[PDB]
Amino acid sequence: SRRGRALLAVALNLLALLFATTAFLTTYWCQGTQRVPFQLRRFHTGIWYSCEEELGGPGEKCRSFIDLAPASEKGVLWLSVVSEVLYILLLVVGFSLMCLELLHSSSVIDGLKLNAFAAVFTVLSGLLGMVAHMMYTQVFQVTVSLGPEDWRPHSWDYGWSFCLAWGSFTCCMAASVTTLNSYTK
Amino acid sequence: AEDLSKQTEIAYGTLDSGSTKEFFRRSKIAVFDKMWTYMRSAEPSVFVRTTAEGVARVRKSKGKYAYLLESTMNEYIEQRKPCDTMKVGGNLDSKG
Amino acid sequence: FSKPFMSLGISIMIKKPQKSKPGVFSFLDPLAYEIWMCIVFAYIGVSV
Amino acid sequence: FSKPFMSLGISIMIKKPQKSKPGVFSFLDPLAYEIWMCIVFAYIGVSV
Amino acid sequence: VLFLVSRFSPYSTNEFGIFNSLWFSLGAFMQQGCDISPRSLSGRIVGGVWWFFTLIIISSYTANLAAFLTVERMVSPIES
Amino acid sequence: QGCDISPRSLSGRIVGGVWWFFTLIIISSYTANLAAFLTVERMVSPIES
Amino acid sequence: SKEKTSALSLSNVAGVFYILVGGLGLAMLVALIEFCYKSRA
Amino acid sequence: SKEKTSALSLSNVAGVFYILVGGLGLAMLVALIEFCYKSRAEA
């Protein structure tokens, strides 16, 4: 029994290893479109590089997302990128301690304290992780309005891998309860 | 104009070669003497080249740059596209 | 010259005040800072 | 005449707005005082 | 986080399971409350801060719905 | 008015969970719409033709 | 004549989530020291 | 001329605190009246 509940917390955090890093590498967070005078181009911007598709070619003309942001919201944005690196790191610190939940690892003796430290390493990660997306979105709401130089999207809609960004935070909380109800029963 | 005196967070300037810059140098008003020193003392480049560059700094600096000019130009820029300026305060001196 | 057909003066030009960013603590914009301190002062006293 | 040594025009003259003095019991103001008393007398009614 | 705290030295019998910790928070968010209440200090903070979250969001919901229905009450379509 | 008796079963808590959201909207719809009457009132004529 | 109505954006109530999570990190911090205070006694 | 308020001030909700401070002062008095009634029975 205790092998299966411990395997479930590792398998969910392995998805949180996948979903949060799939969101972090992709640049498809906000699928916007921009007309020029009627000719609309479709684009997508992530956290680092804003790449728009040119009309009928290779496309992907990539501006860095940093310098286009306004000056007050730029150092606000760095606190999102600092915390997002602090999110992926503390999930790997969380997930590698889930590998010590395996009894093929170290021991039974003081291993139960390793699992009490384990969900804490995922909960204190996900709390910093949810804010790191909340810190991103309120910056992006400004850049639709007034921030950059005269490119303003027709749509500010969240694309894919932003739903994958919440799902890793969802899987961090679903895995932390799996290692804690088996901590009691 | 006394609110541009007691507050140093918002920059304010005139045209580089005009009677308006000539006005604050020869002033003996208590507030207007403080404004002329601040155009010179605390200074990254405050003044602009001509009137159109002064209006263009107002649209760009996002409420951090005020531009002191005539009251007959401060209304027409207000009533023209892209409609991003207003007229605050009263008329300071009188001309004709 | 003739008499002045138009009066004028030196006047300040500033940006149209748009809506800014709403503040980072803009949820407590209705009740001023004299009340949120005094509620906490009255929170402690009624508890004690 | 000379040139104008001051410029002037017609301007509006109204009374200065005084202090908006609310009173110490300004919070009771939305409900009329024939409601606030009848809340208390219907409080004793349902309590009985 | 309320479930995470109540399995440590917050004890006696641990009642705040994950099927109960959702039911306290949903009772706190709809302002109905439940019979259960956190008894340790680290449970009273997570039960305390979430109360201040549901006080602002509900009051922001009622006011903004009073903002739609007042502006819609003032549309006044063209009479002359 | 928070009742002392609480549901415990899951199908008791889905019923008490959805109904609690029913009261959060309707009481906030009723409070918001009484604001819309006392702020801007529109006195309407009985006849128009 | 150009006025309109608006939904509440995220930035309007953005502070309360930060009071929320900032309340959550303080709830984890006292959970350690109360685990320390109980264990010493 | 720069005095302008756009928020709820302490003066608009002042009498609630006056009921609250007045509510505490009548509460501590009755705690003295009840405590003397208990020392009446304990004698």
DSSP for A34-98, written as a single string? EEE--EEEEEEE-SSEEEE--TTSS--EEEEHHHHS-HHHHHHHHHHHHHHHHHHHHHHHHHHHH
Buried b (16+ CB within 10 A) or exposed e, B77-91: beeeeeebbbeebeb
Q: Which chain A residue has the Cα nearest residue C21?
A: A142
Q: Which chain E residue has the Cα nearest residue F20?
A: E30
Q: Which chain A residue has the Cα nearest residue E21?
A: A177
Contact A77, A69 (CB under 8 A): yes
Q: Do C31 and H17 touch (CB under 8 A)?
A: no
What phi and psi, each to the nearest 5 degrees, are found at residue D7?
-115, 140
- For H10, the closest of C29, C30, C35 (CB atoms) is C35
- DSSP class of C26: G
Q: Do G31 and E42 touch (CB under 8 A)?
A: yes
What number of C-beta contacts closer than 8 Å exist between B and C? Answer: 87
d(CA A179, CA B8): 57
Residue B51's nearest CA partner among C13, A150, A149, C18 is C13
Query: 3-state secondary structure string, chain E?
Result: CHHHHCCCCCCCCCCCCHHHHHHHHHHHHCCCCCCCCCCCHHHHHHHHHHHHHHHHHHHHHHHHHHHHHHHHHHCCCCCC
* Block residue for tokens 């008490």: F16
Tokens representing residue F3 in the block:
């009742």
E14 in contact with A at a CB cutoff of 8 Å? yes
Report CA B66 to chain centroid distance, whole Å.
Answer: 5
| SS3 at position A178 | helix
Contact A77, A135 (CB under 8 A): yes
Buried b (16+ CB within 10 A) or exposed e, B34-73: bbbebbeeeeeebbbeeeeebbebbeeeeeebbbbbbbeb
Resolution (A): 4.2
Mutation to test the A interface, candidates G11, G12, G13, most A Cβ within 10 Å: G11
Experimental method: cryo-EM
| Those residues with Cβ within 8 angstroms of residue H17's Cβ, 6 or more apart along the chain or in another chain | C38, C42
- Burial tier of C32 (Cβ tally within 10 Å: 0-12, 13-18, 19+): middle
Q: Do E26 and F32 touch (CB under 8 A)?
A: no
- CB contacts of E18 in chain A (<8 Å) are 177, 180-181
Say if residue B2 carries a ligand binding annotation: no
Do chains G and E meet with 3 or more Cβ pairs nearer than 8 Å? yes
d(CA A157, CA G31): 39
Helices (H), B1-96: 2-5, 19-25, 30-38, 51-61, 73-76
d(CA E73, CA F38): 11
E18 in contact with A at a CB cutoff of 8 Å? yes
Contact A122, A176 (CB under 8 A): yes
Contact H7, C30 (CB under 8 A): yes
Q: Do E9 and G38 touch (CB under 8 A)?
A: yes
* Block residue for tokens 């006293």: C45
d(CA A136, CA G14): 12
